[PDB]
Amino acid sequence: AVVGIDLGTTNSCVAVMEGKQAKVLENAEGARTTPSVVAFTADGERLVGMPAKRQAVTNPNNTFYATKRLIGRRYDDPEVQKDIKNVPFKIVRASNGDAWVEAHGKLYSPSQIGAFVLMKMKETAENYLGHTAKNAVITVPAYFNDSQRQATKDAGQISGLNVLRVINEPTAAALAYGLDKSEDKVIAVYDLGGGTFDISILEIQKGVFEVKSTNGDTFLGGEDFDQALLRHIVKEFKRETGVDLTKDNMALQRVREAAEKAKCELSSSVQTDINLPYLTMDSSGPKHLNMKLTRAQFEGIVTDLIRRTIAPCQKAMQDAEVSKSDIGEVILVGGMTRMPKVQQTVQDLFGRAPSKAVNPDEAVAIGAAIQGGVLA
Ligand SMILES: Nc1ncnc2c1ncn2[C@@H]1O[C@H](COP(=O)(O)O)[C@@H](O)[C@H]1O
Numbered sequence: 001a002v003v004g005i006d007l008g009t010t011n012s013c014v015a016v017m018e019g020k021q022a023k024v025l026e027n028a029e030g031a032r033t034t035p036s037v038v039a040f041t042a043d044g045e046r047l048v049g050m051p052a053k054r055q056a057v058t059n060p061n062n063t064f065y066a067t068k069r070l071i072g073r074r075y076d077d078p079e080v081q082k083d084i085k086n087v088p089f090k091i092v093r094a095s096n097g098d099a100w101v102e103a104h105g106k107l108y109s110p111s112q113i114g115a116f117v118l119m120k121m122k123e124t125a126e127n128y129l130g131h132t133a134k135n136a137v138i139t140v141p142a143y144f145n146d147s148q149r150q151a152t153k154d155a156g157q158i159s160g161l162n163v164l165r166v167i168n169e170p171t172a173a174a175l176a177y178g179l180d181k182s183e184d185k186v187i188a189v190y191d192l193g194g195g196t197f198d199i200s201i202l203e204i205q206k207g208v209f210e211v212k213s214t215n216g217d218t219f220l221g222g223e224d225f226d227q228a229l230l231r232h233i234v235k236e237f238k239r240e241t242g243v244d245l246t247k248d249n250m251a252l253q254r255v256r257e258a259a260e261k262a263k264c265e266l267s268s269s270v271q272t273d274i275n276l277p278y279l280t281m282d283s284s285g286p287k288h289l290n291m292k293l294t295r296a297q298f299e300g301i302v303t304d305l306i307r308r309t310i311a312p313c314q315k316a317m318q319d320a321e322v323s324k325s326d327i328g329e330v331i332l333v334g335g336m337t338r339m340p341k342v343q344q345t346v347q348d349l350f351g352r353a354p355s356k357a358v359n360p361d362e363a364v365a366i367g368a369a370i371q372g373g374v375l376a
Helices: 078-084 110-129 146-158 169-176 222-241 249-265 295-307 310-319 340-350 363-375
Strands: 002-007 011-018 021-024 038-040 046-048 090-093 099-103 106-108 135-140 162-168 185-192 197-205 208-217 271-282 285-294 329-333
Touching: 002 110, 002 146, 002 169, 002 363, 011 110, 011 363, 021 363, 038 110, 046 110, 078 090, 099 110, 106 110, 110 146, 135 146, 135 169, 135 363, 146 162, 162 169, 162 363, 169 185, 169 197, 169 208, 169 329, 169 363, 185 310, 185 340, 197 310, 208 310, 222 249, 222 271, 222 285, 222 295, 249 271, 249 285, 285 295, 295 340, 310 340, 329 340, 329 363
Parallel strands: 002 135, 135 162, 185 329
Antiparallel strands: 002 011, 011 021, 038 046, 090 099, 099 106, 185 197, 197 208, 271 285
């Protein structure tokens, strides 16, 4: 049996072919996705997944996130240099010219950081399978070159996985939607995840996919929506109480989590309450944070982020030499696509209601598992 792993910028997901239906596997914590985050504390204990995510704000120097931006890339790559200016952890030039990360004077390749995450996904699968997992299909963005693909394969190898194939994310997503069995058609894959935005224009010809064009923004993702809201919360709180939370990393840790939670609630509700008891303390005693946030308010806060998905999409269509009319179906990938205003932007972009049929953040792993089943 061959597992399908989406080793994502922000989050990862593992699925496997069970019958004629793929199944996304929950981890021990009951979570269908696992944060692609690896941290090393003062103790030097290693945290992976949610335990690591939970301390990313209080341990910014030694928490590695979005290392997928580094994997397979030379230190001197522009995108690595851009990454350096956006993350608080240390990125270093390895002896061999590659971009690695450092923490507590220890050096790790992005393949090593990936391997920590994959070991967690491998355990998750084995915990369901009841036997060791060896064979895997791993997904990568369509734009990955051979070097990035090879580094991703090496990540899997380190973890004890034989990566039978590396396949592209938009293709994996297309498989999950069954486009495999569709009549010839042009497909837009609109992919807004936690860390990056991708738009792919694919064509299905006789059941086989072709990537006509690709575009996006590697530095536009759900995390930025969370940060925009956290910024609002911090400003509002300071006005409300006089207290500046930017000085307390622990409070910010709690606000960033509450902001993400708020954003997700506003996809199904028009108002949400942000509540953080004993967030800080004053000469009057404990201070509690209590804030109502409407979907209209949240939309206002992140409108620029959403609009940034527009131009990349128009260019992708121009590069694929099609008009909106020529596109037969838009599929949504990435948890962010659950946001109503994002869905509306996608609709305005392509002149059709996007397809919501498959779980947005499970589509890629499901596709991976389908391709796995074939390979097996
Ligand atoms: N129901 C939801 N509403 C809004 N955003 C969500 C929802 N579920 C997940 N997300 C976001 O989508 C991103 C996860 O996408 P991915 O990286 O593809 O797993 C994260 O930034 C989440 O905050």
